Every structure is written in C-alpha cells, then in structure tokens.
Amino acid sequence: IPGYTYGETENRAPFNLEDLKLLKEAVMFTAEDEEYIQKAGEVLEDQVEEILDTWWGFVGSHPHLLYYFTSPDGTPNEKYLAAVRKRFSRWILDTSNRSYDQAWLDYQYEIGLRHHRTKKNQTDNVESVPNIGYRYLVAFIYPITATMKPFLARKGHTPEEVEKMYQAWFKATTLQVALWSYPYVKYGDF
Amino acid sequence: IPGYTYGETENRAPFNLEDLKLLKEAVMFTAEDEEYIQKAGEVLEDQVEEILDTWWGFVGSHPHLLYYFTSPDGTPNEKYLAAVRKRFSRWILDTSNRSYDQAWLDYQYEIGLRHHRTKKNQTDNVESVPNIGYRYLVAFIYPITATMKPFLARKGHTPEEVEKMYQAWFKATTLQVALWSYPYVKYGDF
Ligand code: HEM
Numbered sequence: 001i002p003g004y005t006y007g008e009t010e011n012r013a014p015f016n017l018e019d020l021k022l023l024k025e026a027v028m029f030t031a032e033d034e035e036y037i038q039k040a041g042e043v044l045e046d047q048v049e050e051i052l053d054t055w056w057g058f059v060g061s062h063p064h065l066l067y068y069f070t071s072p073d074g075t076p077n078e079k080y081l082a083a084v085r086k087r088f089s090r091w092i093l094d095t096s097n098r099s100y101d102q103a104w105l106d107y108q109y110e111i112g113l114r115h116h117r118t119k120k121n122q123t124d125n126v127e128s129v130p131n132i133g134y135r136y137l138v139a140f141i142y143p144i145t146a147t148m149k150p151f152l153a154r155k156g157h158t159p160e161e162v163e164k165m166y167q168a169w170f171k172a173t174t175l176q177v178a179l180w181s182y183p184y185v186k187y188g189d190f
Numbered sequence: 191i192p193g194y195t196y197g198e199t200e201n202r203a204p205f206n207l208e209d210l211k212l213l214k215e216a217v218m219f220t221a222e223d224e225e226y227i228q229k230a231g232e233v234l235e236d237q238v239e240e241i242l243d244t245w246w247g248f249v250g251s252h253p254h255l256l257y258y259f260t261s262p263d264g265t266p267n268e269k270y271l272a273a274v275r276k277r278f279s280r281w282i283l284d285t286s287n288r289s290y291d292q293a294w295l296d297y298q299y300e301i302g303l304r305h306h307r308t309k310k311n312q313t314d315n316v317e318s319v320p321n322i323g324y325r326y327l328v329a330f331i332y333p334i335t336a337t338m339k340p341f342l343a344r345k346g347h348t349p350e351e352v353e354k355m356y357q358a359w360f361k362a363t364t365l366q367v368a369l370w371s372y373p374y375v376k377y378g379d380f
C-alpha cells in the first residue's frame with residue numbers, strides 16, 4: 001500500500017509515551033476501551049469498503065471539502081483519491097489493531113504532517129491544495145464518529161457492546177485529531 | 191457575572207459567517223440540530239449546578255489537569271475556580287440559547303484567547319499557568335459530550351429526542367473547540 005509507511009517514518013515524534021498516557025486520561029480512555037476498540041475491528045473488518053462509500057459520499061458531496069483533493073484546475077485529482085482511500089482504509093484497522101506505542105505515535109505525527117502543508121501532496125507526488133485548514137480536522141471528529149456507528153450495530157452484538165464500541169471509537173478519533181494538531185500549533189502551545 | 195463579556199468584546203473575530211456556515215457543514219450541523227440544541231436548554235436548565243459538580247470531579251480528580259487552575263506554589267487558586275465556574279456555567283445556556291451570529295463568533299474568539307496565553311489569567315486578574323496546551327482542548331470534546339448525556343436523559347423525553355439532543359450537543363461542542371484553535375494555530379493554517 002504505497003506511501004503507507006507506518007513503522008519506518010523514522011523521523012521521531014515530538015510527543016512521548018507519558019504525553020500519551022496523560023491524553024488518554026483527558027479523553028477518558030482506559031484499558032476498558034482497549035478491549036472494545038479491538039472488538040470493533042473484527043466487526044468493521046469486512047465492511048471497510050461499504051464504509052468508505054458512505055465516507056466518500058460525505059466528502060464527494062461537499063465542494064468546499066472535496067476542495068482538498070482537487071488539482072489546480074479545480075477538478076478532483078482522481079489519482080490522489082484512489083491512493084488516500086487505500087491508506088485511510090488501513091487507518092480503520094490500524095486504529096483497532098496497533099497497540100498505541102512509540103511506533104504508533106510516530107505515525108500519528110506522520111499523518112498529521114500529511115494534512116498540514118509540511119507534507120501534504122508529497123506522499124502521492126501530486127499537485128493539489130497546499131494546506132488543509134486545521135479547523136476542519138477538528139470538525140471531522142463528528143462525522144468520523146456518528147457515521148461509524150450504524151456499522152457497529154451490525155455484526156450481531158448486544159447493544160451495550162455496541163455502545164462500548166461506539167464510545168471507544170469516539171475516544172480514539174478524538175485522541176488522534178488531538179495529536180495531529182502538532183505541526184499546526186505555534187511551537188510552545190501544544 | 192464578572193469578566194463575562196459576551197456582546198462587548200468588541201475586538202472582531204478573524205472568522206466570519208460564511209466560515210461558520212461551512213463549518214456547520216463539516217460538522218453535520220443543520221437547522222434540525224438548531225431546534226434540538228434549544229430543547230436541551232429547557233432540559234439542562236435546572237441542573238446546571240449538579241452538572242458542574244460532575245464536571246469538577248473530573249477536573250479536580252486529575253492533578254495534571256487541575257494543574258491549569260493552580261497558583262505558582264502549585265496549589266489550586268480557589269478564586270480562579272469560583273470565577274470560571276460562573277462563566278463556564280453561562281456557557282452551557284448561551285450554547286443552547288444564543289443564535290450563532292456575529293456576536294456569538296466574537297465570543298468564540300474571546301473564549302479561545304482565554305484558554306491561550308494571549309488572554310489566560312487576565313479576566314480574573316490571577317496568576318497561574320500561562321498556557322493550556324491545545325492538545326487538551328481537543329481532548330475535552332469527549333468528556334464535555336459523554337458526560338452531558340445522562341443529564342439529557344432526565345427531564346422526561348422520548349429516548350429518540352434524547353439522542354437528537356445528545357448529537358446536537360456533540361456537534362456544537364466540536365464546532366466550538368474547532369474555532370477556539372484560532373489563536374493556537376500558525377497564522378495561515380487555520
Ligand atoms: C478526524 C478527522 C480526519 C481523520 C480521522 C482523517 C484520516 C485520514 C487518514 C488515515 C489519512 C491517510 C493518511 C495516511 O495514511 O498517510 C488521511 C488523508 C487525507 N485526508 Fe484526512 N482525516 C481527517 C480529516 C480530514 C479533513 C477534514 C479533510 C478535508 C477534506 C481531509 C482530507 C484528506 C487529505 C487531502 C488526505 C491526504 C493527505 C496527503 O497525504 O496529502 N482529512 N486522512
């Protein structure tokens with residue numbers, strides 16, 4: 001999966017493992033979500049594609065958001081989308097799967113720098129808009145959560161377990177955006 | 191309510207009313223939440239204090255978060271807390287109440303600058319830590335949402351209406367943090 005370089009980013013993350021523990025805490029994330037994030041894997045596992053299709057009907061629907069995949073000529077760069085949709089999809093599983101260790105942190109850095117201007121458009125060697133305004137990375141916490149939910153309601157679990165999955169998911173999407181802001185914030189204020 | 195200066199901040203917000211409309215959109219916020227945020231008012235209205243008590247048992251519980259109300263001598267500045275807890279509480283209603291107009295935006299700026307170093311500790315003329323790391327303002331989206339919820343389940347409404355209230359609430363807490371990041375982000379990346 002091209003550009004997907006979890007493990008080998010190898011520039012080193014400006015946040016550490018105490019930083020994470022304390023952010024887990026800000027976000028109410030325990031070991032009790034640890035289990036229940038994993039269980040959302042074996043659930044959302046086989047539906048990834050149908051998920052992407054509901055995702056991309058949100059993005060594709062909104063010109064000022066589709067904006068962010070566009071070539072200078074103001075059309076969607078179709079190469080830029082097929083590529084991301086591969087890595088984004090590996091996100092979903094990674095999230096449910098990787099233990100949140102040093103490696104993990106270094107990609108949470110990576111993935112944030114890719115949204116930023118620092119590394120945007122460089123993974124897929126494409127020419128598009130130079131920065132995604134952080135304001136939207138915060139906003140997508142809502143639609144990355146809400147819309148995952150109907151899909152947790154599926155693989156035949158007890159609605160309580162669905163809640164616990166939902167919530168974990170909400171907690172980890174937030175955690176992630178939270179970290180992503182690193183390259184965005186004025187040095188010293190993160 | 192001292193320092194509470196909604197309406198008269200009177201420095202002018204670097205985001206506008208198109209910016210808001212488009213962020214509403216990123217956050218799935220429609221006129222259908224408009225109603226249902228209001229209805230959460232007449233619900234959460236009488237329980238504000240019991241809410242603050244569940245809030246402050248989260249904050250009070252966590253030294254690295256209580257951190258942010260502390261005097262230099264590393265104790266909680268009790269004046270700094272009683273004061274904020276008044277304005278924070280006016281937040282809850284404001285949120286349910288104010289139409290999201292120009293005025294509103296200018297306080298969403300205000301309230302973000304107060305978290306920042308730009309205006310932190312100046313409202314209540316107190317001496318405490320100079321900046322709250324943005325990373326935590328993103329993290330508190332989770333606990334500002336989740337924990338509001340049991341309180342929506344109260345004033346005797348049909349669980350569907352409770353969901354619609356919850357969700358609206360989740361959407362508006364996010365919207366707000368999203369904007370708050372303005373003074374935090376490197377000029378040009380918001
Ligand atoms: C919580 C919010 C978001 C999440 C969880 C998320 C998740 C992801 C992931 C996992 C990737 C692939 C990164 C990689 O594997 O290398 C990605 C890429 C991308 N997403 Fe996001 N994303 C979010 C916000 C946004 C927003 C708000 C937009 C605006 C349209 C956006 C547009 C893009 C773009 C342009 C890329 C490719 C960046 C590049 O490498 O040039 N994303 N996202």
Ligand code: HEM
Nearest residue numbers: 255258274277278281301304310311313326327330331334
């Ligand atoms: C979604 C997250 C948050 C929300 C919704 C929120 C809401 C509020 C509101 C409404 C106020 C009063 C502002 C005013 O009326 O002037 C306030 C003040 C304050 N909160 Fe937050 N807040 C959040 C994050 C945080 C975090 C993560 C901390 C860390 C402990 C924190 C600590 C404080 C402090 C120190 C003040 C007073 C700032 C000053 O004027 O010096 N807040 N918050």
